[PDB]
Amino acid sequence: KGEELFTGVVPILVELDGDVNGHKFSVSGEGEGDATYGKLTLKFICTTGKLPVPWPTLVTTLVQCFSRYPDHMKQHDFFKSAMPEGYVQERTIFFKDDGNYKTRAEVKFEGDTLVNRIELKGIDFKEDGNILGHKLEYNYNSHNVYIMADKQKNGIKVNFKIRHNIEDGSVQLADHYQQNTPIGDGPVLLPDNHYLSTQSALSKDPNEKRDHMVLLEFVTAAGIT
């Protein structure tokens, strides 16, 4: 049922409103996903002016239904199974020795288009830490995203560690704790334990003068053979 919605190229819309230490901002993104290849291509624009946090810190917040699940793992793909009604995705992201983001998003189809609508709230950030101080490099590392069933909520629980390169050569860790629960009442796939292997490339549109991020991302499910 849900998986059939992902056999081809799907348009994606992302809309985020944020407030980090009282700095309010909005981000809009557009692009497309091709789950057959685990592939996402998107361009994000800060629609309120200058983004008050580094772009890389928003990548995880800004559609894991575009992950490539190998055929032998298709019974473990919660994300697609919740479609088209969708799922709620909630996180706390702990920036080591700094503040935290808490996010809530709804991921679902509107017509033909896969939409990610997010509210983000950041608190306890240091004024001249790596986030508010803009000390993170404009790049992105490759990670493993660990997934387990959460049967009482008919959903999944997800944990991983994001590594952000700091401009001095060091690393800013961002520990992610995540919960996804279906919006609809229908059956979903509750998975055995497994992970997603991720890679992401960040770039700039040379003709774009707005504060923005171009993202190319590949993600593949693994850990069950």
Swiss-Prot record:
Outcome of mutating V145I: In Azurite; shifts the excitation and emission spectra to shorter wavelengths and increases quantum yields compared to BFP
Domain of life: Eukaryota
Result of changing Q64M: In Citrinine; leads to excitation and emission peaks of 516 and 529 nm, respectively
Biological role: Energy-transfer acceptor. Its role is to transduce the blue chemiluminescence of the protein aequorin into green fluorescent light by energy transfer. Fluoresces in vivo upon receiving energy from the Ca(2+)-activated photoprotein aequorin.
GO biological process: bioluminescence; generation of precursor metabolites and energy
Result of altering D98E: In mut1.27; shifts fluorescence lifetime from 3.03 to 2.85 ns
Record's subunit section: Monomer.
Transcription regulation keyword on record: no
Effect of H143D: In Cerulean; leads to improved quantum yield, a higher extinction coefficient and is 2.5-fold brighter than ECFP
Protein name: Green fluorescent protein
Annotated phenotype, changing E217G: Suppresses the 399 nm excitation peak, leaving only the longer wavelength peak at 475 nm
Impact after mutating V63N: In R10-3; matures to the red-emitting state with excitation and emission maxima at 555 and 585 nm, respectively
Effect of T198Y: Gives rise to yellow-emission variants. In EYFP; leads to yellow fluorescence, folds faster and more efficiently at 37 degrees Celsius and has superior solubility and brightness
Result, substituting Y140F: In Sapphire/H9-40; exhibits a huge Stoke's shift, with an excitation peak at 399 nm and an emission peak at 511 nm. In Azurite; shifts the excitation and emission spectra to shorter wavelengths and increases quantum yields compared to BFP
Lineage: Eukaryota, Metazoa, Cnidaria, Hydrozoa, Hydroidolina
Mutagenesis or variant effect for A201K: Abolishes the tendency to dimerize and leads to monomeric fluorescent proteins
Modifications after synthesis and translation: Contains a chromophore consisting of modified amino acid residues. Maturation of the chromophore requires nothing other than molecular oxygen.
Phenotype when changing S28R: In mut1.28; shifts fluorescence lifetime from 3.03 to 2.76 ns. In mut2.2; shifts fluorescence lifetime from 3.03 to 1.94 ns. In mut3.3; shifts fluorescence lifetime from 3.03 to 1.88 ns
Outcome following mutation: A201V: In EBFP1.2; shifts the excitation and emission spectra to shorter wavelengths and increases quantum yields compared to BFP
Family matches, as InterPro entries: GFP, GFP-related, Green_fluorescent_prot
Gene: GFP
Keywords: Chromophore, Luminescence, Photoprotein
Phenotype for V171A: In mut2.1; shifts fluorescence lifetime from 3.03 to 2.50 ns
Protein family: Belongs to the GFP family.
